[PDB]
């Protein structure tokens, strides 16, 4: 495929919250593994939360997290690609629906 | 789509109109009284506010799915062609979707 601009489609395709939109948002813009930790500084919450959202995006497959702190999360490298395959499956879900 | 098949799509609808939990909530309830109701008798089954209710009717009128009637009464009651809004409504939203997955 912009991805700040979908937030709508992204959070409803994936039924996600804001706080998960945030974490993969921001995940995607920095480019490079981070700590849970770090996260937590950046949106000001405590770990626990922040690894709440982690494991949401990755039962995704949005998010992978590596063992060595202690675990590293990154974004697919192919990360584009698969959101918009997930958009368009997302958008076909709901035209049944209206059925 | 169909009158008891609306609850199944509960997601979809407030996902796509950007509405909340009550205001759904609101919206399915009416559907399925199939009657018009008061502010007052919504408040009542959901226990909240007669504003957080005519919050709600405000909004879902603004959408289109619900008429106000002045009878000193304020009733509300669904739109004629709720189902065929609905309808069009979902699929210009997974219309905006696939348009956003260029």
């Given at each position: ?16 919250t ?7 948002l ?74």
């Amino acid at each position: 495929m912009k991805l700040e601009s979908k937030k709508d489609e992204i959070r409803c395709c994936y039924k996600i919250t804001d706080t998960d939109v945030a974490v993969l948002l921001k995940m995607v813009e920095i480019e490079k593994p981070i700590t849970s930790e770090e996260l937590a500084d950046i949106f000001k919450l405590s770990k626990t939360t922040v690894e709440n959202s982690l494991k949401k995006l990755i039962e995704l497959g949005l998010v992978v997290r590596t063992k060595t702190p202690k675990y590293y999360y990154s974004i697919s490298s192919n990360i584009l690609e698969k959101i918009r395959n997930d958009l368009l499956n997302c958008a076909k879900r709901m035209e049944l629906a209206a059925t």
